[PDB]
């Protein structure tokens, strides 16, 4: 079905009262006055402005922020150097090198994420089979040089150690959906 947005049906003819109403509308600027009144109502409303940085906009546990590498509760790294995140990364922002550790464990020797190349899509955290790489909810990590956004394994493990109290709670609140 369809409807007309501007087509008028029949005519209203001509009347002295209607002509006087249109004359008053043209001369006394009635629609302009009611536009003024609308802006006046908005003036006397309450603004929708939060007091940043003391107030923050609401988010969800699903929010994709700064990357981090998590651990098991024992303290062992969750990552097993399987390169699924590297394979699924649409921007090729992940570089992984690996070798057996001194105890024979399958661990990374290089895990780099170019955050200037990353598109913050969460494909790494949804392809990780052991929940090692995550996008924790940090978003206020802007730097002053281009280099500081080239994360390596030490930076990502430090982020995982810093944000574990929040990332674990978000994964607890979210993991039944995924």
């Amino acid at each position: 079905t369809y409807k007309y947005v501007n087509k008028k049906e029949q005519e209203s003819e001509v009347d002295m009262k209607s002509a006087t109403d249109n004359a008053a509308r043209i001369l006394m600027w009635t629609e302009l006055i009611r536009g003024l009144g609308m802006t006046l109502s908005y003036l006397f409303r309450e603004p929708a402005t939060i007091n940043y940085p003391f107030e923050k906009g609401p988010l969800s546990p699903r929010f994709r922020g700064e990357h981090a590498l998590r651990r098991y509760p024992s303290g062992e790294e969750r990552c097993i150097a399987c390169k699924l995140c590297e394979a699924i990364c649409p921007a090729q922002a992940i570089t992984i090198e690996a070798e057996p550790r001194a105890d024979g464990s399958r661990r990374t020797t290089r895990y780099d994420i170019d955050m200037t190349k990353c598109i913050y899509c969460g494909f790494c955290q949804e392809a990780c089979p052991v929940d090692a790489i995550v996008e924790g909810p940090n978003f206020e990590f802007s730097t002053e040089t281009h280099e500081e956004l080239l994360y390596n394994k030490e930076k990502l493990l430090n982020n995982g150690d810093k944000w574990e109290a929040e990332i674990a709670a978000n994964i607890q609140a979210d993991y039944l959906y995924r």
């Binding site: 009262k17 004359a23 009611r34």
Partner: protein
């Protein structure tokens, strides 16, 4: 357990207005022309 999912309430959601709703306000043209002419005459006197 029971399947829990994001679903509408069993009674459905309430009616959502969507039509164009202008207040259709203001006084008549005769009345405001009469007010203006009366103001003119009083000011002239």
């Amino acid at each position: 357990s029971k399947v829990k999912q994001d679903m509408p309430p069993p009674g459905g959601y309430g009616p959502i207005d969507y039509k164009r709703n202008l207040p259709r306000r203001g006084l008549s043209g005769y009345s405001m022309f009469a007010v203006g002419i009366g103001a003119l005459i009083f000011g002239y006197w």
